[model samples]
Target: NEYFNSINDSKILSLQNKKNTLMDTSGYNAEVRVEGNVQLNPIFPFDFKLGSSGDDRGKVIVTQNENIVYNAMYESFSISFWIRINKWVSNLPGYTIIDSVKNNSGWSIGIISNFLVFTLKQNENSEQDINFSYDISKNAAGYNKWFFVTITTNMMGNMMIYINGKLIDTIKVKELTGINFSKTITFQMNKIPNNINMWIRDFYIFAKELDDKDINILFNSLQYTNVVKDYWGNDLRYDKEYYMINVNYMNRYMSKKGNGIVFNTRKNNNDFNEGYKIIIKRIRGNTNDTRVRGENVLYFNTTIDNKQYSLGMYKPSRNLGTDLVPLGALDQPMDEIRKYGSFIIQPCNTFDYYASQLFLSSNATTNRLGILSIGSYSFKLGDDYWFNHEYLIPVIKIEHYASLLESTSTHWVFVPAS
Candidate 1:
C-alpha cells in the first residue's frame, strides 16, 4: 500500500512537468508582437478638407501666417498641390485658397468665378508684377475629380502653368527685372471670401523651378515624401515610400491577400493590388555586422469593400500547425488581432527572390532545436495544380547556419505604387 501511494505521487509530478501538447488557439502571432506592439509607422496623413456645409465650413483654417511658402531671397520657386472641388457656379461667389499679409505686398492663389488665379507682386516696394490666372472651369466638370495643379517659374519671365502634369500654358514677359516674393504667407485663411468646399493634399514649394521630370515625379509619386511629422510636433522627418515587390521572375509579382496574407495573383497587371511598403528598422553593418539583420513590416496597401486599407503581415505565436496566419486582417476586421501585425521577412541569399519562407519561434520539437518554418506543401481537396503549406516545419529560427549565412531584405529594384 505504501509503494502504490508513492507511485501515484510520482505519476502526478510527471504529468505536471510534461510539455504542452495541445495546440494554442488564441491566434497570438509573433509578427504582431513588435517590441511592445508600438506603432512603428503612421498611416494617417495630414490633408486639408473643407466641408461645403459644416459648422467650420470653408473657414476651417490655421488662420495665421503659417508661411506655407516663402522665397526669402527673392528667388525662383515652384509650388504644387492636389485639389478636389465640386463644379463651381460662376455666380456662387469665389474663394481664397491662399493669401498674403498685406493688401498689395506678396502673392496669392485664389479661385474667382470660374478661374483659378495666382498673383505675385513686387513685395513692399518693387517695380515688377507677377501674375497668372488659369481657366479651370472646364476642368471642374466632375464631382470628386482630383487634379494636380503645379505652378513653376524660372524667374526669367518664364512662368508655366501645369494641370495634371501637362504644361497647359506658359506666361512670358519681357524680362523679370528681378524676382520679388512676399515676407508672410497664409493658406486657407479665416478672411472672408465666401465659404467654398474643397480637399487639398501634398502642398509643395521647391526653391528652384521644378523641371519636367521633377514635376512628373511629384504628380505621380505623391507617396514619396519627406515632410511627414516625426515623433510629433513641428519636428519633421523623411518617411520612406512604398514599393511593389517584383519577384525575379516573369509575371510573378510579390503580392499579398486582402488582409496582408501572402498569396498569388498575377494576371498581366497586378501593380495596384501588389503594392507593399517595407519598413526595415534595423540595418546590419555593411562589413562588420553583415548578417541578414533586420525586422521588416510588410505594410501592403490592400483593398477591402472596394476601398483601400493598408496594414502589415503577421504570423502566429505557437507552432501549432503548418499554418502561417495573417494577423490584423481588414477582411477579418478584428483589430484585436490586427495590432499583432509585425513580421520578419527572411529570404535566404540562395533563392534569388522566389522564396517566401516564413518562420515562427517555438520551444517544442523538431529541426534546429525549436523553430518552425512554413514551406510550400501539398494541396486541398478538389484543388487543381494548387498547393499550400500545412504539414511541414523546418529550422530552429533561421538566424545562421554552416556557410549558409542568413540573408533577408526588403530592398528590391522596382517602382512604387502611387
Candidate 2:
C-alpha cells in the first residue's frame, strides 16, 4: 500500500512538471538575439569591419541572402548614439553610404571635416539631393568626452536632430524614407562601402519618433545613467538646467528727484539762482467720481545732487477743446521719499543747454508752455524757446490727470501679440 501511494504522488508531480513545461514553451518570454562584430574581408563577401582600435574603418555590406538585417520599424523612428571619429577616407564626390545594389542612389549620414551631415541622393547628380550639416567647432564639442546625438523622424516628414539634449537643427524630408530592411542590409559604422574610419559606442535605435521635449528628457535621463558611462566614456554626464531671475521697481518718485529745498534769499533778484521758497500741492479725486474737489496737496521739500530743491504748486486747466485737464502734486520730504520709495535722479543734468530750471507741459491742442524764473529778478513764462538764463539750477515738478481708462498696471502693452 505504501509503494502504490508513493507511485501515485510521483505521477502527479510528473504531470505538474509537464504542465509547467507547456506553459513555458507557449509563453511570451521570448529572447531576441542581435548580430554584431562581423569580420570583413575580400573572400568572405563582406566589405567592412572595426579597425585594430575597435573603430569603424573598413567597408561593410548587407544583403537579403544572409538575413542580416534587424527588422525593426514603425511609422515613426528615432536613432541615438555617440561616435568618435578617426579620419575621413577622402573629399571626393562623396561616397555610397546605404546604397541599393540595383541603383546608384542611397541615403547616407556622414561628416565633412568637423561637420555632422545627412544627405539623400537620387542619382550620381548631387543637385537632386537634400543635405543638412552642422559645424561642430561653434558648439561645445569635446574630444575624449562622450557627446550625445539623437535623430527623430515623424510620419509627417519632419526631422529633428539634437545634440546633448539641446535641439540645434530641424529639417523636413520624405516620410519614412529609410533603407528598406526587408532585404537584409548591413550597418557598417566607419566603413560605409568605402574604407572610412570612425569609432562608436552606446549605439541605439528606436521604432518611434520622439518629440523635441521627449528627446531632451530622454537625453537628460540617459546621460545620468551608468549605462551611458559604460558605453561611452568615464567623463560623460548630463547637462544641468539653468534659471535666471530679474526684478525692477517703477514708481512715481523713481521718476523725479526727492523733496529737497532750493533757496535764493533775494540776494540778487536778477539771478535765477536767487534763493526762494517753493510750495506744491496735489488733490486726489474721489474713487467714484474722477472730478470731486478742486484743491491741491502741498509738497514742501526735495533735493537734487545733494543740493536742496523745492517743487512748485500744482496747476489745473479745463480746456475741453484739448486734452488739457486739471492735475495735482504730492508733498514729501527726502526722508519720507527715501523710506517709502526709490530715488529717481541725483544731481542729473536737467540743463539741456543752459543754467536755468525749466518746467514744461503740453496737450493735444498743440499748445505747449514752459515757466522760467531768473533769480529773484524776473519770472517769465513762454511757449517758445525765447527765454535763456545763465546758471539757473532747475528743480522740475510734473503732473497729469489720469482716468480709469488711462491707468495701466505696467503703463504699457505690446501692440501685437507676442
Highest-TM-score candidate: 1
1-418: candidate 2 lDDT, tens digit per residue: 3533332221100101121121111121222212445333332111123442244334333333222123333345565655443333123224333332234444456554444665544445441233334333321221322356777765466777777776767767653343343332234444334433444433344555666666555555543231112111332111211110000101001112122121222332121222222212222212222211111111223333455443432222111113222111235454443222221110111101001112232321112232222111122222224553221122222233233212222121001000
Compute the lDDT of residue 1 as modeled in candidate 1. Answer: 38
The lowest-lDDT stretch of 10 consecutive residues in candidate 1 is 9-18
C-alpha lDDT (0 to 100) for residue 2 of candidate 2: 53
lDDT of 1 by residue, 134-212 (tens): 3433222222234678888666647777876777767673343444444434445233444445665555555566778
Q: Tell me how candidate 1 scores on lDDT.
A: 0.39
lDDT of every model, 2 decimals:
0.39, 0.31
Q: In angstroms, how far off is 312's CA in candidate 1?
A: 34
lDDT at position 210, candidate 1: 72
The TM-score, computed over Cα atoms with residue i paired to residue i, of candidate 1 is: 0.37
After the best TM-score superposition of candidate 1, give how far the Cα of residue 45 lies from its true spot, in angstroms: 5.5
Cα displacement (angstroms), candidate 2, residue 126, comes to 7.9
